[PDB]
Structure formats: structure tokens, C-alpha cells
Design a protein around this nucleic acid. Structure first.
Lengths: 482, 103, 461, 166, 377
RNA sequence: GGAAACUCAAAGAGUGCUAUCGGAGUGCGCGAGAGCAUUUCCGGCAGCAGAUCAGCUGU
């Protein structure tokens, strides 16, 4: 019933036939006994249902959902409204514990939010573009004016970066301990934050990087230029790994599902595209949205969210392959075969700056001009985190244990292709029928070396000539043999 | 036997039938001789007059109006005063008889 | 309108008391565990690096060694920690390997001792008192085969007949023995092979093909009534005591030093000869050596199977021992030390984890077979970690960088240089064979598993 | 083959089933003979399966005198008759890791199907259970060991001296 | 962990428990998270038998609810699936784990034994023998263990050879409690009465005296005397004449206080050669130990032996005319002892007069007689 | 300068804490099973009936 989520995509020798039966039987048994775990999964996800026809799902606002929601989630529904520094920006941590906010004037605050524990506030006097955590509460990087800084957990300036000549799109590849930077110059550079080494400096050659997302599933970096090109990169090849034509003009935002399959992308020509990634098929377009949506994000369940400046619009289940789950904007003519906004919120006069879904709770954080606001959204959070990797109930001991284990299991930087299941194969020299060899005075020294080299060349030429030799009218018939 | 010894998936090396004996329960005398003086005196008394299932089967090989309601206390007394091996053999024999007459 | 939102509730996740263990809630989704193959690859690479970090194979000597280099080692088969070593100036010793000391010593003979083995010898006019004293017998080249008791505190049942229970004496010399493990019979080799039992001073039977000496023998480990031997006509002979006769004979290209049966197949044996490769024969078809283990540089002085039935220990005339698996045909790995010269006798112990090697310097050293598995009883999460990353190394052993980490050793410079020149000689002779096969037309593709056999009585059936 | 162990203690007799085995060949190694010292691995190796306390003080003195001359007594023979299984002659005879070769023949005389053993493996296994002491017994007693062994020692000393208390 | 392993092993019962419609997914996730918390509390660092008890209570109540929803929804009793024996298998695992991790609490041991005796219809007496033998091994001293499952082996299976075997094993294990000896005599008399009733049932449908009880009485007397003496005099055999003699008088007093309890709850038993084995008791207490106490200390004890030896007959009849008919024997022995005693004569006179007063025509005249006339007329 | 540690964070040592189809029968193994496996009573239903079980009634 659930084995598609857990699925991982005639011989002569009798012992090899039995071994193949054993290994694919073990594959089937392990997939079934892994799929029988969601019976033991701890809790169920959330939902708001229409339960009628007049009760639409997007005529529901924060007052009634905060009334009929839990007290703990209602008190999680924060508003850290700050006005003396500029249009704010969000990044929650990898687990949903810490929050990192950034004003465009000078403000950078890294803080718990379910506890009132402000653990690193720092003002500056230069425009801080964005910011993101590295692995923990411990180290967080800010893409400042013209040098990216990384900071300790209390606020001491750990490192200016000599490289990264400027920066406006910066995030982290977690299992590799990589920091990825894209700036207003045509660069994209990788800096490992464990060894401290730079890894690659990929010249983009496509103008300034307008937007960027990260794929979680294979750690490729998704740039989006002013050409409308969505390119995907990795530090193997200096060329872009693939390119896409998403929108026309520039693309202002791009966001990847956590399963790596789906890509949402919103341009500047009032256009949105939904893409498959593993087949690169444009799934469905969305036109007719009134203003070019500046930032799109995507939940952990498929519940995406456009952010058109004053509006934020959340569509539930708009990533199927059908033509029904195309995200529309209004039910016309009595048509229940559309996809209206699952819900929506309209802020007053402040343009929303960026989104971000809280990882393991049911709320969408959005940052704008006057500060932060979280939105209670019932299905837009993964309910049941897995405690061996992410954990919203850490201690010091297990935080240091996860630090030392992931630093021991740092995947090397070469191992991020387009498909990370492709490191076990043979190297494109397959030979399915494998030919296993069964079924086929210094002048004088140099001169003698040249003699032996010329003899080896002549023997090679004669063996190839013999190989080619082995692998290959009346009056002239009378006048043959001469 | 060596051929299917190289087709099996995990070989747990106690291969043959090992020493797997149940522990000396308190119900069974181990070496079948009196150890203590109490065992000495009680067995030298009980050498002569013991119900070693022979008199039990001979006096319990009995068990219709008596089956319905006439011997409603006599059958209870007989089935109560029946001993262990006599009761087990009676249960097995009556179960086999009911298996023959009710299939 | 019906709404809901997930409830962490902070009691089924963080505990109520202090001492109980917090929950590790669990979701087995390939969404939430993204990099499967690269992460288990890097766990395999860390497994290989940690195995190289813990590759500490040597465990100890025992005693101060013998006088002048061992030449025969006999493990017993009932108990675990008892091991007899016979050495060159007629000195046999019976070691308790637990405390790594010797029980008793004997000036056993005058000349070179040649072969010893232990027996639980059932006499007919005496009960086998084999839970209080243990019996070993030893043949030398001064025409004597002595059978000895040993007082041993393996048990504590009793409370005196220490040594030299009896002495069989032979016409010619003697070259080796082994004891048939049932019914107190033992066979020797010398001028021709003889079969004694311990109730006679004279040989019960004589079982040669012709008048040719026999270098070594070995009985089975099951189907005990047959045995094999090797003589300096470069020949492997089999014998069957049920028919009381020799039964087949192959002749290889060089002299077989030490044969050894398999204690789990009962019809396969390994064969260690002076050409530098231990052959592995199937008995009931002796036309093809169904494996050949081909990594030494000098004469292959001894081999033995582990009682788990799949690992081969071998010890060369060059100063090195190797451990093979049966199913591969090349070396798993190699031990060596500066202070051992010319290892002449190697034996697995019955624990199947410790190989007893005996050099010519005098010492009887010991080694762990798995050079990284320690011997303590480990906790269950540690045993899970060890078996899991060992299975990862086994599954990923074909990747090139963890192959080039898991393969290399510090092979001593003598063995490395001589194996390098042997490799360039073999490549040169293969090139000349390719030229000759480029010319000629009637040239058989001679199989490597049948390269060394040059003759078989009872040719084909 | 060490599968039952007998320990004698100044509150009572204990008999331990040996769950898994000790490494015999490497039994002088550091990484094996620190496992006897630490506790988290010794209870992987030895569990308590019987503990009968002699309760009379004079019967404790009498058991101590019979052990100290190397002779079986009523309580020891009682718990071995209870705990030690009749290993039938098809399989083997049972083994018992006792502390001394003076005691050995006197249990082999009385029980035929038992087989005593004291090599250095039984020596350091009994040493490990002596070191860990009370924490093996998991609460099957009423009274600590040291005051009881103080009284038993003074009584055994006076019974050896036959000291005139007049 | 291993808590993950136990929780993952309990998944197929909820699998078929939802596959048949008697439990939907919401409440089965509810019981699974409750069992998750209970099982981590069970496998904590320093858990408790209270936690084992209440987890067992949770599993028994979810079993009762599963049977109730089975007889309500599917309207069948046994679903012939994995869903039926799984909860009892888990309760067996929890009781085995609790008796391994906490072996000194007989309350928990007894709850395991009562649960297994109740489920003997599904899993027979071999598991009873196994857990009871390991209980006997881990607690040889506590005599209530032997008494309880000897009562089990006699009243549920009635296998007298194994019953006498475990009584003799326990009596070898601690021959210094009075209770085990006395209840062994009680079981031995129950067996001999059931055997004589078998003989009477043979006679109804138309040798073996109390020598077993008398021999175990004799070994009871000498062994409880010796071990009471060794319970006193702790480490050093006390060596002074009057102290040794007075402690011999003390153990004579305690030993006769046990023998009178034997006479009491044998007179409640009697139905047999009651005067035969009571006179064996009194022949032993005539032929005394360490002191020969008839002319020595405890003369009140000597008077009580004389009183029992005289009033041996009178303790059985409601028809006291037979007591007056045979009272010539009682008053004849009474005169034979009054002729020997002087002030114990007076106390014995008061005792016999109180006995006849508790008791109360031609024999009442001829063969005291004042009370005999006052009861006859 | 003395430091209240009850504001919190990063760390270092010492101490203590756990294990790895169901009862019989039936061809069966040396008072006896640790298992090989079922159409045999079965684990279908209620009633007599000694107090949720022992003997039966059909099915």
C-alpha cells in the first residue's frame, strides 16, 4: 500500500541464478519490512478539510485557525516584529530548532524561537543579503556587503572569507559540510567548512545569479539566471551539468521538493512553471498571476507557496502528473476539477521578502519589511522526524555526537553527480558478455633505447597487419597466375 | 550433505546434535538411590505397599442412567480419586473413543 | 470546518523522569535519508581504514622456544589449548597454550625428530583414562616411534606414569606419522608406509606401491578409514584401509611436502609442494586440481585447513606465512616478522581464530587469523557495528581506492623484489608462448588447474 | 566446556551457569583479562542460577571446616544434586568449574556424572566472581558479606586453635 | 537500541489487527505509542517491577478489549489468525523478562505463576515446571515455594511420586523449619487417606499404616532438636554443665511444643489408627532425649503426657455412655498414675475433673460416678 | 580588587547504567524431546452437568 515510497529502482550458471534469487528476494523482504514501519510511526499529519461546499479552504484566516488550534502551536505562532532595521529574511535550521533572521540594513539574529533564548544577536552597518546555518546552532554564515562571514554561536566573527568577492545567494550542503556561494559577479564557488579548503570556482558565464535553490536528494545546486535558464551544477565539471529554459526574462525564485523530484520556478514575466527534475519535463505552466511572484517555496508534503509581495498563496497537492492539479486562482462556471489556493494570507502593505517552511512543525515562516510572521498551516510540515539524523530535542552530548559522526561520514566532494545512486556501477565499459581471456655515452643509451622502441613499434605493426590478414574476363582467366 | 552445506545462508557451527539436556528438575530423583536418611526410611517403608499405577488402573478401569444422572456423585468420586497416570491414560482412552464415535 | 495540527506534547519525546532513556522516533523514508549509496560507501572506506589501523596480528611466543628450530607441530583435536611441538635435536614438548608454558619436555630421540601426533589410544586391557592424562607419539629417523603419556591438569578428578609408555621400533627409518582418529590405529612413513596399532610391537600392515620412500602422510577428519600421502617420487598416493590397499596415485611436477584434508568436505585436500603454489585437489576426480593458490616466492612448506572449513593457512620456505580463502585462489593476507626464518610447520587451532606457526629459529609463534578481530566478548551494539561494516567491506571490495587500501601490506623487501622479478619472468614467458601460439596450429590451451599433473594411474572412468 | 561454576561464600553456596565461554587460547591477553575486572562484560559471561544460604551460624562454621579440609557436606551436596543436570551418556558428562584440586576428587566420588575442573580459566572466572561479589547476586540475600565473614573467620580461627575460653 | 527491536517485533499483530476491521488506524497508533512509552520505561536504566506490573495490566486490558471487539464486531470468538495468541505471547515474554531482571520479589513471581496456571489450558504444565524449577533454584530457602507448588502438584495433577519427591528435596534443603515437616506430614496423611478411600471405593463397588508419618515424625523430632540447638550456641559449643542442661531443657520444651501441635492437627485429621500413632508419639515422649525428663525438669510436661495417655479414649464420642463403659480403663490407668504422683496427682485430678465436666445409665451407676448419675438421671 | 552561580553558553576530567501455527495425538529420537509436520481431537456452536475447567449430546 505504501511500497512505492520505499522502492529503490535467464542465466546459465546455477549458483549465480540462486544468488540472484537470494538477493532480489532479500530486496523484496527488506522493502516490505521497511514499509511496515509507518504502522509504528508516532503520529499522523494534519489537515483542514472543507467538509461542505460553501466552506472553502481559503476563506479561513489566522484568527479562526489560531482559535481552534492548540495552545502550544498558537504560542509557536510568533511575530518578532522589528522596525528599525530593514526588510527581514528567514532561514530555519536543518532541524526545526533554531532560527536565523537577517535585515537588509545590518541586523543578524540567530536565536531559538520555541524558547526565548536569543543566543547571537549582532548589528552591523552594512547590507546583509542572506544567512544560513552551517550544521548546528554553532556556526552560521551571513552573506554581507562584499565578504561572506561565518560566526560562532555567541556572535564572535569567526571568519571573513578572502574569496567570495560578493555574495547574495548562499546556503549549505549538509552531509558534505559544503558552503555554496553565488554572487552578483558571474561566479559560483564551493568552500568546505571542515577542512577550510576551497573546492571549486565554477565560472557561470551567464550573467548574475538571480536565484538559487539546493536539491536535497543529490546536492546539486540549482541556479537561475537572467536568461530564463535554470542551470544545475556540481563541482565535477566546470560546465553546468544541465540547463533548462524555465521562464522568459529573469527567474526570481526556484524551489526544490525534499525528494528532489519536483521544481517550482517563478519568473519575472508573471509566470510560474512546475518541472519534473529526473525527466526534465515541463509538467504544467501557470500564467495570469497578477504580479511576478518574487519568492516561491515548497513544503515537505507537496504544499507549495507563492509569495507575490502582499499575498502568500499555499496550494495543496499541486505536484501530480495530471492536468487536474494545475494550480489555478478561482472556481469559475461550477468547476470542481480545478485547484484553487488551499489557503492564502494577505499582509497589509509590506512586501514579503522570503518564505521558509518550518521543518518538523505545521507552520510556514515568512519574512517581510516589518519583520517575521509564522502562519499555521495544517499539512505543510513533516510530522515524524527521524531521530538518527535530525532531532528537535537535542542535548549537548548528542549534538557533539552528531558532529563527530557526520564529520567522520563527510562524503567527499566528487560524489555528487546528477544521480547519487550511480557510484556503484561499472565504468561504462560493461561487456555484458565479459571477455575473461577465455573466448577471444648517454647518447648511446638513448640510441639503443630508440632501437628497442622502433622494434616494439614494428612488432606491433606486424601483429596488427597479421590480425587484419586473418580477419579478411575470359582471356584474363586464361592469363591469370602470372 | 556437503553440497547443501554450501547452499545454506548462515552456518551456526554447533552442527551436530549437541549436549542439549534439560536441567535436573526437583521432581525427578537424579541417581535413583536414597541420599538422605529420610529417603532411606521412607523407601524402606514404601518397598512393600505402593500404588505404582497397577492397582490404580485396576481400581480405576470402571468409568446409561449412571452416565446421565444416577451416579452423579459416584462418578465424581471415582474421577476425583483417580491418580495422575491413571487419569492421563483415562483421558487419552476416552478421547480416542470419542474420536472414533464422533468424527 | 475541521482543522488539526501536529502535537509534539513533550512527554512522549522528552522523558518524565531523568534516568530513563529518551525516545528515538523513527521514519524509514528514503525521502528523509537521501544519500544511501555514497554514505554506506564512505562507511566502507572508514571500515577499511580502521581495519588497517587495527591490523595487529601477533599475539605471542610460548616459552623460550625450543633448541634448534621446530620441524613438527601437532594440534590435538579434543581439547583446545594443548599443542605438541617436536624439534630438531630430538626434543618434543607438550604446551599448554593458555598460560603459554610447557607441561613436560623429553629428550625423545637422538637424531632429527620427524613427526608427531596425539592420540586417545584405546587399549584393550585398560580403560582410556583420557580425562586425566594425554597421549602423544613421535617418530624420528633413528628407526623409533615412541608413544608417551603426559600428566595434564585439564581436569581435577584424580588424587605417576609420566613418560615413555612404549617404543615401537622399525626396520628402516621413519619419516612421518599420523594417527587414525578412531580405534587407536596409526600410520607411518619411511621406506614404505606401515600401519600399526598400539597393541603390537610389529607393523600390522605394509602398504606401498613400490620401493619408494614417503615424505608425509595425513588421515582424514571424517570417513576416517582412507588416507593420503606424499613421496619423493613427486607423487601423491591415496590409500584405503577398508580395502587395506593403495588406491590411486598421481605424479605432479615437483615433490609434495605437506598434504592436508578438509574437515568439512571430507573429499577435498590441499597439497603443498616445492613449486610455489598450494594445489587443492578433489579426490574422486584427480585429473584436475580444482584450485591452485599461487602466491609465494619459494617452497610451500606446510598448509592446513581451518576447522571452519574455508580458510587455508600456509607457511613457506621463505620467511613468511599466508592466509588464503578457499574460494579465491590468491592471498587474502600475509604475516612475517624479522625474527622468524623458514617457517616449517603451520597449524590452525581448533578455535579457528589462531594459527600456530613454528619457525626454524626455534620459536613457536602464534597469530590471529583475522588480524583485527579481537578476542574479548563484545557488547551487542559493538558486534553489530563490526559485522555491519565488515559486510560493507565485503560488498564494496571491488571499488578501486578501497581495494588499493585493503590490499597493500609491508611485504619484506626480499619477498617483494623476488616476486617482482618472478612476475616479469612469467610475463616474458607468456609473451613467448603467445608468439609460439601465433605460429603453430596444434597447440592445446593448457589449463592452469591441470598444468602440474603429469600422470595418473587408473587414467579415466 | 566450563558450563557450570561453583562459588562458596560466607553467607551461602552459589552455582552459576556459564552463558558463553571465555577465550581459552588468548587468556593471557590484556583485552581479555581486563574483562574480568570490568562489570559490564562479566555479567555477559556469568549469570546467577542458584544461591542457597546456609542460615545457621554453626552450620556455616561446619561447612567452612569441611571445605577447608576438602570434603563435601550436606548443603553443598544438596545444591549440586538439585542444580547439576544428569548429562546422559549419549551426549557427555557435565562439567563444573570448582576452585581447588583438593575438593575435586571428593565431588567426583559422590557424583559420577559431574566432572570437576580447575585450570587457570576456572581460577580467574572464580576470581572475577569474587571481585564483583555482591553485584552479581542481584538481591537474593539478606546481609552483606564482610561482617558475616568476620564472624566466620573468628570462629574458624578459634576452632582451629581450640582456644580455651575458660 | 533494543527497544526499537521489541517494538518492531510487535508489528504483525497490529498488522492483522487492522487487516481485520476490529481496530482502525487512529486507535492502533494510540495503543502503539502507549506501548512505545511503556516499553522504553521498561528498558530504561534502572526500571522497576511496578513498571512491569502496570505494563502487564495494559496488555491484559487491551487483550480483554480485543476479545470484546471481536465478539461485538465480527461476532466470532476465535479469529484463527495471528491476533489471538499474540498478546498472551507478549505477556509471557514480559513475565520472563521481569523474572530475569528482578528475581527477588515473590509478589511478581507469584503473579507470573498465577497467570500461567490460568493459561494452562493453552500452554500446558511444562512451562509451569520450567519456571517453577528456576524459582526453586533461585530461592531454595523460602519454604513457601515448595509448599505452594507441592499443593499445586497435589491438587491440580495429583502426582504423588513427584509430590513426595519435591517434599523430600525441600526437606533436605532446609530441615530446620517446623512448617515444612508439619505440612509434609499433612500431605502424607492426605495421600494415605485417599489411598484407603480408594480401597473403600473398591469395597463399595464390590501394611500401609501410618508408619510413613511416624518415621518422618521421628526424623522431624531429632533433626529439629539438633538444628534448634545449632540455631542457639552460634559459633562456639558452650561448655558448662548447667547451661548445657538448661538449653537441653529449652529444646525439649520447644520440641514438645511442636509435638503437641502434631497431636492437635492430627486429632483434627484422625479417621485412621489414631490411637496407634498417637501412642507412638507418646512412646517416643516416654523414651526421652538428652535428659529422660520424667523425673527431671518439665514435670508439667510429664503431667501433660500422662493426661493424654489417660484421656486417649475420651476425645471421640458424643455418646458418652460408651465413654462410661470403657472408662474403667481410663480411671484404672488414672489410679495407676495417682498411685505414683502426689501434687501432680492433684493437678491431674483437676484436669480429669475438668475433662469429665466437659463430657457432661446402668454403667453410669456401676462402672466421677456422681457426674455419671447426674448425666444419666 | 572579593566574588553570590540561583542569568546562561562552549568545552575537560572523575564517578555511577543494560541484553539477543497453541496444547496433545500421529511416523517419529534414548521413565524421555531440545525438533522434523499435521487433517488426527482440534482450536466451528450452544445444553446437561461437579465451582472459568473434567464426562457427554448433536453438529
Amino acid at each position: 500500500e505504501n511500497q512505492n515510497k520505499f522502492e529503490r529502482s535467464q542465466t546459465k550458471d546455477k549458483k549465480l541464478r540462486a544468488g540472484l534469487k537470494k538477493i532480489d528476494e532479500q530486496y523484496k523482504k527488506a522493502v516490505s519490512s521497511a514499509a511496515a514501519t509507518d504502522y509504528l510511526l508516532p503520529e499522523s499529519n494534519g489537515y483542514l478539510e472543507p467538509e461542505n461546499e460553501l466552506e472553502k479552504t481559503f476563506k479561513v484566516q489566522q484568527s479562526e485557525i489560531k482559535s481552534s488550534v492548540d495552545v502550544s502551536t498558537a504560542n509557536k505562532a510568533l511575530d518578532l516584529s522589528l522596525k528599525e532595521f530593514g526588510p527581514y529574511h528567514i532561514k530555519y535550521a536543518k532541524n526545526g530548532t533554531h532560527l536565523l533572521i537577517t535585515g537588509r540594513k545590518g541586523h543578524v539574529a540567530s536565536m531559538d524561537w520555541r524558547k526565548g533564548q536569543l543566543r547571537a544577536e549582532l548589528f552591523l552597518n552594512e547590507t546583509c543579503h542572506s544567512a544560513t546555518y552551517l550544521q548546528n546552532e554553532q556556526y552560521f554564515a551571513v552573506a554581507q556587503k562584499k565578504y561572506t562571514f561565518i560566526y560562532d554561536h555567541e556572535g564572535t566573527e569567526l571568519h571573513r572569507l578572502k574569496q567570495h568577492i560578493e555574495a547574495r545567494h548562499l546556503d549549505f550542503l549538509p552531509y558534505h559540510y559544503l558552503l555554496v556561494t553565488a554572487g552578483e559577479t558571474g561566479w559560483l564557488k564551493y568552500h568546505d567548512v571542515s577542512t577550510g579548503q576551497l573546492v571549486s570556482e565554477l565560472r557561470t558565464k551567464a550573467g548574475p545569479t538571480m536565484a538559487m535553490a539546493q536539491n536535497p536528494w543529490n546536492a546539486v545546486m540549482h541556479l537561475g539566471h537572467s536568461n530564463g535558464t535554470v542551470s544545475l551544477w556540481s563541482p565535477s565539471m566546470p560546465e553546468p551539468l544541465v540547463k533548462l529554459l524555465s521562464a522568459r526574462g529573469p527567474v526570481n525564485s526556484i524551489a526544490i521538493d525534499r525528494s528532489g523530484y519536483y521544481m517550482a520556478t517563478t519568473g519575472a514575466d508573471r509566470s510560474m512553471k512546475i518541472w519534473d527534475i529526473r525527466n526534465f519535463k515541463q509538467l504544467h505552466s501557470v500564467e495570469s498571476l497578477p504580479t511576478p511572484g518574487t519568492n516561491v517555496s515548497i513544503s515537505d508534503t507537496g504544499l507549495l507557496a507563492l509569495s507575490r509581495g502582499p499575498h502568500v498563496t499555499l496550494w495543496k497537492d499541486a505536484l501530480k502528473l495530471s492536468g487536474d492539479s494545475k494550480p489555478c486562482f478561482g472556481s469559475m462556471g461550477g468547476n470542481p476539477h480545478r485547484n484553487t489556493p488551499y489557503m492564502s494570507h494577505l499582509f497589509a502593505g509590506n512586501k514579503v521578502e522570503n518564505l521558509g517552511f518550518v521543518p518538523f512543525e505545521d507552520l510556514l515562516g515568512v519574512g517581510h519589511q516589518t519583520g517575521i510572521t509564522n502562519l499555521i498551516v495544517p499539512g505543510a510540515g513533516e510530522a515524524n522526524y527521524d531521530a538518527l539524523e535530525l532531532n528537535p530535542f537535542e542535548t549537548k552530548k548528542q549534538r557533539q555526537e552528531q558532529e563527530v559522526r557526520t564529520l567522520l561520514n563527510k562524503l567527499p566532494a566528487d560524489t555528487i553527480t546528477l544521480d547519487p545512486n550511480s557510484i556503484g556501477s561499472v565504468d561504462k565499459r560493461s561487456s555484458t558478455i565479459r571477455l575473461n581471456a577465455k573466448d577471444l655515452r648517454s647518447f648511446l643509451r638513448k640510441k639503443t633505447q630508440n632501437v628497442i622502441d622502433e622494434r616494439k613499434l614494428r612488432v606491433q605493426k606486424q601483429l596488427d597487419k597479421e590480425k587484419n590478414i586473418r580477419k579478411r574476363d575470359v582471356i584474363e582467366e586464361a592469363l591469370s597466375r602470372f | 550433505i556437503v553440497q547443501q552445506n554450501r547452499r545454506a545462508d548462515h552456518l551456526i557451527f554447533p552442527l551436530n546434535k549437541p549436549t542439549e539436556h534439560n536441567h535436573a528438575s526437583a521432581f525427578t530423583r537424579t541417581q535413583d538411590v536414597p541420599q538422605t536418611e529420610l529417603q532411606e526410611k521412607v523407601d524402606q517403608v514404601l518397598q512393600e505397599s505402593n500404588l505404582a499405577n497397577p492397582e490404580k488402573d485396576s481400581k480405576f478401569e470402571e468409568l446409561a442412567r449412571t452416565n446421565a444422572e444416577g451416579a452423579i456423585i459416584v462418578e465424581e468420586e471415582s474421577d476425583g480419586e483417580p491418580l495422575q497416570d491413571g487419569q492421563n491414560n483415562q483421558q487419552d482412552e476416552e478421547a480416542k473413543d470419542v474420536n472414533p464415535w464422533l468424527a | 470546518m475541521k482543522i488539526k495540527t501536529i502535537k509534539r506534547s513533550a512527554d512522549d519525546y522528552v522523558p518524565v523522569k531523568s534516568t530513563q532513556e529518551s525516545q528515538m522516533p523513527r521514519n524509514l523514508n528514503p525521502e528523509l535519508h537521501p544519500f544511501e549509496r555514497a554514505r554506506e560507501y564512505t562507511k566502507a572506506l572508514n571500515a577499511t581504514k580502521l581495519e588497517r589501523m587495527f591490523a595487529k596480528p601477533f599475539v605471542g611466543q610460548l616459552g623460550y622456544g625450543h633448541r634448534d628450530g621446530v620441524y613438527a607441530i601437532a594440534k590435538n583435536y579434543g581439547s583446545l589449548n594443548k599443542l605438541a611441538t617436536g624439534s630438531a635435536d630430538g626434543v618434543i614438548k607438550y604446551w599448554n597454550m593458555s598460560t603459554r608454558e610447557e607441561f613436560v619436555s623429553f629428550k625423545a630421540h637422538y637424531g632429527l625428530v620427524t613427526g608427531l601426533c596425539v592420540t586417545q589410544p584405546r587399549f584393550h586391557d585398560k580403560k582410556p583414562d583420557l580425562k586425566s592424562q594425554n597421549f602423544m607419539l613421535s617418530c624420528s629417523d633413528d628407526k623409533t616411534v615412541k608413544l608417551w603419556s603426559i600428566n595434564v591438569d585439564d581436569y581435577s578428578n584424580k588424587n605417576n606414569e609420566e613418560g615413555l609408555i612404549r617404543t615401537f621400533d622399525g626396520e628402516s627409518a621413519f619419516q612421518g606419522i599420523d594417527s587414525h582418529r578412531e580405534n587407536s590405529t596409526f600410520a607411518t612413513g619411511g621406506a614404505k608406509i606401515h600401519l600399526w596399532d598400539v597393541n603390537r610391537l610389529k607393523p600390522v600392515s605394509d602398504l606401498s606401491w613400490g620401493a619408494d620412500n614417503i615424505t608425509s602422510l595425513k588421515f582424514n577428519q571424517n570417513e576416517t578409514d582412507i588416507l593420503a600421502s606424499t613421496g619423493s617420487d613427486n607423487s601423491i598416493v591415496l590409500y584405503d584401509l577398508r580395502t587395506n590397499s593403495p588406491t590411486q596415485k598421481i605424479v605432479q611436477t615437483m615433490r609434495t611436502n605437506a598434504i592436508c584434508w578438509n574437515p568439512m568436505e571430507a573429499f577435498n585436500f590441499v597439497t603443498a609442494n616445492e613449486d610455489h603454489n598450494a594445489y587443492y585437489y578433489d579426490m574422486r576426480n584427480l585429473s584436475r586440481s580444482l584450485n591452485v593458490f599461487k602466491d609465494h616466492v619459494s617452497a610451500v612448506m606446510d598448509v592446513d585447513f581451518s576447522p571452519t572449513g574455508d580458510e587455508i593457512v600456509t607457511g613457506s620456505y621463505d620467511k613468511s606465512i599466508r592466509i588464503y580463502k578457499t574460494n579465491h585462489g590468491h592471498s587474502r593476507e600475509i604475516y612475517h616478522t624479522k625474527r622468524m626464518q623458514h617457517v616449517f610447520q603451520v597449524k590452525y587451532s581448533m578455535d579457528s581464530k589462531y594459527i600456530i606457526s613454528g619457525s626454524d629459529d626455534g620459536n613457536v609463534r602464534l597469530w590471529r587469523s583475522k588480524a583485527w578481530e579481537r578476542s574479548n566478548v563484545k557488547t551487542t551494539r559493538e558486534k553489530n557495528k563490526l559485522e555491519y561494516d565488515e559486510k560493507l567491506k565485503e560488498r564494496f571490495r571491488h571499488m578501486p581506492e578501497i581495494k588499493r587500501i585493503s590490499r597493500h601490506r609491508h611485504v619484506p623487501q626480499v619477498i617483494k623484489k623476488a616476486q617482482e622479478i618472478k612476475n616479469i619472468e612469467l610475463s616474458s614467458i607468456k609473451r613467448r608462448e603467445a608468439n609460439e601460439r601465433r605460429t603453430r596450429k596444434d597447440m592445446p590451451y593448457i589449463s592452469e588447474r591441470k598444468k602440474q599433473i603429469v600422470g595418473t594411474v587408473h587414467k579415466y572412468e | 566446556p566450563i558450563e557450570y561454576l561453583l562459588f562458596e561464600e560466607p553467607t551461602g553456596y552459589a552455582v552459576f551457569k556459564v552463558k558463553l565461554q571465555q577465550d581459552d587460547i588468548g587468556s593471557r591477553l590484556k583485552e581479555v583479562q581486563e574483562q574480568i575486572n570490568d562489570f559490564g562484560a562479566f555479567t555477559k559471561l556469568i549469570e546467577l542460577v542458584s544461591f542457597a544460604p546456609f542460615k545457621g551460624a554453626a552450620e556455616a562454621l561446619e561447612n567452612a571446616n569441611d571445605i577447608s579440609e576438602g570434603l563435601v557436606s550436606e548443603s553443598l551436596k544438596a545444591i549440586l544434586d538439585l542444580n547439576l543436570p544428569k548429562a546422559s551418556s549419549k551426549k557427555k558428562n557435565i562439567t563444573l568449574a570448582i576452585s581447588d584440586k583438593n575438593l575435586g576428587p571428593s565431588i567426583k566420588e559422590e557424583f559420577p556424572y559431574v566432572d570437576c575442573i580447575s585450570n587457570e580459566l576456572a581460577q580467574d572466572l572464580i576470581r572475577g566472581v569474587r571481585l564483583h561479589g555482591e553485584k552479581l547476586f542481584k538481591g537474593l540475600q539478606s546481609g552483606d558479606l564482610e561482617r558475616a565473614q568476620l564472624g566466620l573467620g573468628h570462629a574458624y580461627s578459634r576452632a582451629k586453635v581450640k582456644f580455651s575460653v575458660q | 537500541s533494543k527497544t526499537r527491536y521489541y517494538l518492531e517485533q510487535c508489528i504483525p499483530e497490529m498488522d492483522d489487527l487492522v487487516e481485520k476491521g476490529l481496530f482502525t488506524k487512529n486507535e492502533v497508533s494510540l495503543i502503539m505509542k502507549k506501548r512505545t512509552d511503556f516499553e522504553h520505561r521498561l528498558n530504561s536504566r534502572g526500571s522497576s517491577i511496578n513498571d512491569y506490573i502496570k505494563y502487564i495490566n495494559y496488555e491484559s486490558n487491551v487483550n480483554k478489549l480485543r476479545a470484546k471487539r471481536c465478539k461485538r464486531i465480527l461476532q466470532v470468538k476465535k479469529t484463527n489468525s495471528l491476533s489471538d495468541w499474540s498478546i498472551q505471547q507478549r505477556i509471557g515474554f514480559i513475565y520472563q523478562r521481569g523474572t530475569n531482571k528482578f528475581p527477588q520479589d515473590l509478589k511478581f513471581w507469584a503473579m507470573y505463576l498465577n497467570y500461567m496456571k490460568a493459561r494452562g489450558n493453552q500452554t500446558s504444565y511444562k512451562k509451569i515446571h520450567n519456571i517453577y524449577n528456576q524459582l526453586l533454584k533461585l530461592h531454595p530457602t523460602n519454604v513457601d515455594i515448595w509448599i505452594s507448588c507441592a499443593k499445586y502438584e497435589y491438587e491440580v495433577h495429583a502426582n504423588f511420586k513427584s509430590c513426595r519427591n519435591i517434599f523430600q528435596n525441600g526437606l533436605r534443603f532446609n530441615p530446620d523449619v517446623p512448617k515444612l515437616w508439619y505440612e509434609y506430614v499433612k500431605f502424607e496423611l492426605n495421600f494415605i487417606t485417599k489411598l484407603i478411600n480408594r480401597r473403600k471405593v473398591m469395597g463399595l463397588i464390590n501394611a500401609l499404616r501410618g508408619d510413613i508419618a511416624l518415621t518422618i515424625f521421628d526424623v522431624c523430632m531429632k533433626t529439629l532438636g539438633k538444628h534448634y540447638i545449632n540455631k542457639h550456641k552460634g559459633y562456639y559449643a558452650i561448655s558448662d554443665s548447667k547451661m548445657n542442661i538448661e538449653l537441653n531443657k529449652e529444646t525439649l520444651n520447644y520440641l514438645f511444643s511442636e509435638s503437641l501441635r502434631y497431636i492437635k492437627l492430627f486429632d483434627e485429621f484422625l479417621d485412621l489408627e489414631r490411637d496407634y500413632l498417637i501412642n507412638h508419639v507418646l512412646q517416643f515422649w516416654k523414651n526421652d532425649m538428652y535428659d529422660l525428663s520424667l523425673r527431671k525438669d518439665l514435670p508439667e510436661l510429664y503431667l501433660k503426657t500422662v493426661m493424654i495417655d489417660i484421656t486417649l479414649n475420651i476425645r471421640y464420642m458424643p455418646v458418652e455412655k460408651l465413654d462410661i463403659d470403657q472408662l474403667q480403663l481410663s480411671v484404672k490407668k488414672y489410679f495407676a498414675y495417682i498411685s505414683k504422683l502426689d501434687s501432680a496427682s492433684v493437678k491431674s485430678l483437676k484436669n480429669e475433673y475438668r475433662s469429665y465436666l466437659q463430657d457432661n445409665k446402668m454403667n453410669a451407676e456401676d462402672d466421677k460416678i456422681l457426674d455419671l448419675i447426674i448425666s444419666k438421671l
